[PDB]
Each structure stands twice: as structure tokens, then as C-alpha cells.
Design a protein around this motif. Structure first.
Motif, PDB file in Angstrom:
ATOM      1  N   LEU A  44       0.835  -1.180   0.000  1.00 24.95           N
ATOM      2  CA  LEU A  44       0.000   0.000   0.000  1.00 24.95           C
ATOM      3  C   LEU A  44       0.886   1.253   0.000  1.00 24.95           C
ATOM      4  O   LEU A  44       0.583   2.248  -0.659  1.00 24.95           O
ATOM      5  N   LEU A  45       2.012   1.189   0.709  1.00 26.44           N
ATOM      6  CA  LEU A  45       2.978   2.286   0.702  1.00 26.44           C
ATOM      7  C   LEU A  45       3.669   2.495  -0.657  1.00 26.44           C
ATOM      8  O   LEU A  45       3.625   3.601  -1.207  1.00 26.44           O
ATOM      9  N   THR A  46       4.302   1.443  -1.190  1.00 21.91           N
ATOM     10  CA  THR A  46       4.885   1.474  -2.542  1.00 21.91           C
ATOM     11  C   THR A  46       3.928   2.078  -3.589  1.00 21.91           C
ATOM     12  O   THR A  46       4.222   3.111  -4.193  1.00 21.91           O
ATOM     13  N   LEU A  47       2.776   1.442  -3.785  1.00 24.62           N
ATOM     14  CA  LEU A  47       1.767   1.947  -4.711  1.00 24.62           C
ATOM     15  C   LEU A  47       1.386   3.407  -4.454  1.00 24.62           C
ATOM     16  O   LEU A  47       0.762   4.033  -5.307  1.00 24.62           O
ATOM     17  N   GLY A  48       1.732   3.938  -3.277  1.00 24.37           N
ATOM     18  CA  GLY A  48       1.492   5.337  -2.973  1.00 24.37           C
ATOM     19  C   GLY A  48       2.653   6.274  -3.283  1.00 24.37           C
ATOM     20  O   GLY A  48       2.525   7.498  -3.142  1.00 24.37           O
ATOM     21  N   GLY A  49       3.792   5.727  -3.697  1.00 32.11           N
ATOM     22  CA  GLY A  49       4.908   6.575  -4.051  1.00 32.11           C
ATOM     23  C   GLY A  49       6.217   6.340  -3.322  1.00 32.11           C
ATOM     24  O   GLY A  49       7.164   7.114  -3.497  1.00 32.11           O
ATOM     25  N   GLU A  50       6.291   5.292  -2.507  1.00 32.17           N
ATOM     26  CA  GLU A  50       7.547   4.933  -1.861  1.00 32.17           C
ATOM     27  C   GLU A  50       8.272   3.872  -2.681  1.00 32.17           C
ATOM     28  O   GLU A  50       7.640   2.928  -3.168  1.00 32.17           O
ATOM     29  N   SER A  51       9.596   4.002  -2.795  1.00 33.59           N
ATOM     30  CA  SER A  51      10.323   3.319  -3.863  1.00 33.59           C
ATOM     31  C   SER A  51      11.266   2.153  -3.524  1.00 33.59           C
ATOM     32  O   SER A  51      11.694   1.433  -4.432  1.00 33.59           O
ATOM     33  N   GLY A  52      11.607   1.945  -2.260  1.00 32.21           N
ATOM     34  CA  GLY A  52      12.547   0.880  -1.962  1.00 32.21           C
ATOM     35  C   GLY A  52      12.277   0.142  -0.668  1.00 32.21           C
ATOM     36  O   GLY A  52      13.209  -0.237   0.044  1.00 32.21           O
ATOM     37  N   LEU A  53      11.003  -0.083  -0.362  1.00 35.09           N
ATOM     38  CA  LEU A  53      10.639  -0.730   0.891  1.00 35.09           C
ATOM     39  C   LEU A  53      10.988  -2.226   0.906  1.00 35.09           C
ATOM     40  O   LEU A  53      10.865  -2.902   1.938  1.00 35.09           O
ATOM     41  N   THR A  54      11.434  -2.738  -0.237  1.00 35.62           N
ATOM     42  CA  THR A  54      11.702  -4.165  -0.379  1.00 35.62           C
ATOM     43  C   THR A  54      12.748  -4.682   0.610  1.00 35.62           C
ATOM     44  O   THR A  54      12.533  -5.717   1.245  1.00 35.62           O
ATOM     45  N   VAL A  55      13.864  -3.954   0.749  1.00 36.98           N
ATOM     46  CA  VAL A  55      14.966  -4.341   1.666  1.00 36.98           C
ATOM     47  C   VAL A  55      14.544  -4.388   3.132  1.00 36.98           C
ATOM     48  O   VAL A  55      15.199  -5.035   3.947  1.00 36.98           O
ATOM     49  N   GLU A  56      13.468  -3.683   3.470  1.00 33.80           N
ATOM     50  CA  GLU A  56      12.907  -3.761   4.817  1.00 33.80           C
ATOM     51  C   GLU A  56      12.327  -5.150   5.112  1.00 33.80           C
ATOM     52  O   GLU A  56      12.231  -5.565   6.259  1.00 33.80           O
ATOM     53  N   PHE A  57      11.944  -5.884   4.084  1.00 39.40           N
ATOM     54  CA  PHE A  57      11.231  -7.124   4.345  1.00 39.40           C
ATOM     55  C   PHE A  57      12.103  -8.364   4.259  1.00 39.40           C
ATOM     56  O   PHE A  57      12.973  -8.470   3.380  1.00 39.40           O
ATOM     57  N   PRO A  58      11.873  -9.307   5.187  1.00 39.43           N
ATOM     58  CA  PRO A  58      12.459 -10.649   5.074  1.00 39.43           C
ATOM     59  C   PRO A  58      11.975 -11.325   3.784  1.00 39.43           C
ATOM     60  O   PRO A  58      10.776 -11.357   3.516  1.00 39.43           O
ATOM     61  N   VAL A  59      12.908 -11.823   2.982  1.00 39.09           N
ATOM     62  CA  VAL A  59      12.566 -12.544   1.771  1.00 39.09           C
ATOM     63  C   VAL A  59      11.831 -13.802   2.207  1.00 39.09           C
ATOM     64  O   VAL A  59      12.333 -14.528   3.073  1.00 39.09           O
ATOM     65  N   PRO A  60      10.626 -14.051   1.637  1.00 42.36           N
ATOM     66  CA  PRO A  60       9.840 -15.240   2.005  1.00 42.36           C
ATOM     67  C   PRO A  60      10.321 -16.504   1.272  1.00 42.36           C
ATOM     68  O   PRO A  60      11.224 -16.438   0.426  1.00 42.36           O
ATOM     69  N   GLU A  61       9.711 -17.641   1.588  1.00 40.68           N
ATOM     70  CA  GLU A  61      10.093 -18.923   0.989  1.00 40.68           C
ATOM     71  C   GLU A  61       9.397 -19.154  -0.366  1.00 40.68           C
ATOM     72  O   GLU A  61       8.263 -18.710  -0.568  1.00 40.68           O
ATOM     73  N   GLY A  62      10.075 -19.842  -1.289  1.00 45.70           N
ATOM     74  CA  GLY A  62       9.445 -20.253  -2.534  1.00 45.70           C
ATOM     75  C   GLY A  62       9.798 -19.469  -3.788  1.00 45.70           C
ATOM     76  O   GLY A  62      10.566 -18.500  -3.745  1.00 45.70           O
ATOM     77  N   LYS A  63       9.236 -19.904  -4.916  1.00 44.11           N
ATOM     78  CA  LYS A  63       9.446 -19.234  -6.199  1.00 44.11           C
ATOM     79  C   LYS A  63       9.023 -17.762  -6.125  1.00 44.11           C
ATOM     80  O   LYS A  63       8.014 -17.426  -5.514  1.00 44.11           O
ATOM     81  N   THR A  64       9.812 -16.891  -6.743  1.00 42.30           N
ATOM     82  CA  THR A  64       9.509 -15.463  -6.805  1.00 42.30           C
ATOM     83  C   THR A  64       8.694 -15.136  -8.067  1.00 42.30           C
ATOM     84  O   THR A  64       9.246 -14.596  -9.028  1.00 42.30           O
ATOM     85  N   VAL A  65       7.393 -15.461  -8.067  1.00 47.36           N
ATOM     86  CA  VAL A  65       6.509 -15.204  -9.242  1.00 47.36           C
ATOM     87  C   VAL A  65       6.041 -13.739  -9.409  1.00 47.36           C
ATOM     88  O   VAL A  65       5.959 -12.990  -8.448  1.00 47.36           O
ATOM     89  N   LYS A  66       5.729 -13.322 -10.626  1.00 51.78           N
ATOM     90  CA  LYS A  66       5.379 -11.917 -10.834  1.00 51.78           C
ATOM     91  C   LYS A  66       3.864 -11.653 -10.895  1.00 51.78           C
ATOM     92  O   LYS A  66       3.085 -12.509 -11.313  1.00 51.78           O
ATOM     93  N   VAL A  67       3.468 -10.463 -10.445  1.00 54.72           N
ATOM     94  CA  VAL A  67       2.084 -10.172 -10.068  1.00 54.72           C
ATOM     95  C   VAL A  67       1.546  -8.974 -10.853  1.00 54.72           C
ATOM     96  O   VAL A  67       1.834  -7.815 -10.533  1.00 54.72           O
ATOM     97  N   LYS A  68       0.768  -9.257 -11.887  1.00 57.69           N
ATOM     98  CA  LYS A  68       0.413  -8.225 -12.858  1.00 57.69           C
ATOM     99  C   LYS A  68      -1.059  -7.887 -12.786  1.00 57.69           C
ATOM    100  O   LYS A  68      -1.461  -6.733 -12.965  1.00 57.69           O
ATOM    101  N   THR A  69      -1.860  -8.907 -12.522  1.00 53.62           N
ATOM    102  CA  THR A  69      -3.299  -8.729 -12.430  1.00 53.62           C
ATOM    103  C   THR A  69      -3.875  -8.898 -11.010  1.00 53.62           C
ATOM    104  O   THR A  69      -3.421  -9.737 -10.196  1.00 53.62           O
ATOM    105  N   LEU A  70      -4.906  -8.103 -10.747  1.00 54.13           N
ATOM    106  CA  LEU A  70      -5.721  -8.282  -9.574  1.00 54.13           C
ATOM    107  C   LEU A  70      -6.034  -9.761  -9.337  1.00 54.13           C
ATOM    108  O   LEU A  70      -6.118 -10.190  -8.186  1.00 54.13           O
ATOM    109  N   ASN A  71      -6.155 -10.541 -10.415  1.00 50.92           N
ATOM    110  CA  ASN A  71      -6.363 -11.998 -10.322  1.00 50.92           C
ATOM    111  C   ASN A  71      -5.248 -12.724  -9.590  1.00 50.92           C
ATOM    112  O   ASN A  71      -5.499 -13.361  -8.566  1.00 50.92           O
TER     113      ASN A  71
END
Length: 196
Positions: A44-71
Motif C-alpha cells: 500500500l505504501l509502494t503503490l502510494g509513491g515509496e520506492s525501496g521498501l523491499t529491503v525492509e522485508f524478510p525474503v519469504p520462501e518459494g518461487k519469486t513469481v510476478k504479479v500483474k493482475t488483480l487476479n
């Protein structure tokens, strides 16, 4: 717009955080809230204009799939919420899809994450209890009987009463607050705001 204030207005536990985007993230992680919620705030923060919050988060387990649709997003949030949310942050969508994902996450945070309801638990009843001797409870009044109810509620928990027994009393208390006179109009909807 303004995700930090949105977050703080709607997710009560987050008001204790420094209002900055990363601080909110460091705060909720420290507080060890359900992984889904902290990652959702990230998106919700990123989509609002924040650009590098990724490093704040622990990388989760599993394949890193990409997310393009609300689906993808909605299905990924069934059993793989953290990974899908993290993938949104890491490679964010744009335009109308970004908007749909935004409203999805916001709506999810507000009405399904369980993070929107105020502090339940023992601190609640002691807090609402400390609101009745400051109030002249000496007054020819049954408002003093509220405090005696509230006192018995805190007492009952310590003395080992069942959740069912505790719950009866809680129903009664909420009942008694509603049945307070119309000259307690503001006082009513305040009390009813802390107990739902």
C-alpha cells in the motif's frame, strides 16, 4: 492518498509508530503482527509513491513469481500472501491495475486483516475501568454500578472464570452502557467505541 495517515487512522496498533513509511514497517515487524498485514502495508505504501521498501522485508520462501493482475494477487493471497505481496512491492504494477490492487489491499486491510479492530484483551477492560472514578461515581447513580461490573470483570479473569462466564458479563456491560440516559450521549458512543 497519504498511505501513512490512512494506515494510522484505520489500523489502531500503527498509531504508536513514527509516521514515516519505513518506520511503520520496522514498527509492525518488531510488534510481530501477522506477516500478511505488514507486507500489505508495504504494498500500500509502494503503490502510494515509496520506492525501496523491499529491503525492509524478510525474503519469504518459494518461487519469486510476478504479479500483474488483480487476479494473480487475489489467488496468491490464499496460501502465499507474503510472497505475492512482496513480489508486488519488488516489481509494482502501473496505471489502472495499480489502482485496483491499491483498493483491494486497502479494503483487505480495513475489513479482513483483523488489524482494524481496537485492542481487545485485558488492557481494554482496565482502561474502560479507569474511566469511572475520575467521573464522579459517588453521584446518586447507577453509573457507579458500571464500575462495579467492570471491577468484577477484571476480578473474574484473575479468579479463573471461563471465557463463557466472562463473555456473559461483557454482554451485560455493553447492555448497561446502552441503557444509560440521553444526557450521557457523548459518553455513550465513546464507551461503545472502545468495546464495539
Amino acid at each position: 492518498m497519504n498511505e501513512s495517515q490512512w494506515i494510522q487512522k484505520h489500523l489502531p496498533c500503527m498509531r504508536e509508530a513514527n509516521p514515516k513509511p519505513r518506520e511503520l514497517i520496522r514498527h509492525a515487524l518488531k510488534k510481530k503482527k501477522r506477516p500478511e498485514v505488514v507486507y500489505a502495508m508495504g504494498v500500500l505504501l509502494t503503490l502510494g509513491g515509496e520506492s525501496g521498501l523491499t529491503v525492509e522485508f524478510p525474503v519469504p520462501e518459494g518461487k519469486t513469481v510476478k504479479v500483474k493482475t488483480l487476479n494473480q494477487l487475489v489467488n496468491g493471497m490464499i496460501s502465499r500472501a507474503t510472497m505475492t505481496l512482496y513480489c508486488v512491492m519488488k516489481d509494482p504494477p502501473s496505471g489502472s491495475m495499480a489502482t485496483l490492487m491499491r483498493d483491494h489491499i486497502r479494503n483487505w486491510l480495513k475489513e479482513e486483516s483483523g488489524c482494524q479492530d481496537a485492542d481487545g484483551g485485558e488492557e481494554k477492560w482496565a482502561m474502560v475501568y479507569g474511566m469511572i472514578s475520575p467521573d464522579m461515581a459517588e453521584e446518586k447513580t447507577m453509573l457507579k454500578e458500571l464500575k462495579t461490573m467492570l471491577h468484577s470483570r477484571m476480578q473474574m479473569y484473575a479468579l479463573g472464570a471461563s471465557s463463557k462466564a466472562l463473555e456473559n458479563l461483557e454482554k451485560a456491560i455493553v447492555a448497561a452502557v446502552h441503557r444509560l440516559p440521553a444526557s450521557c450521549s457523548t459518553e455513550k458512543m465513546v464507551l461503545l467505541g472502545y468495546l464495539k
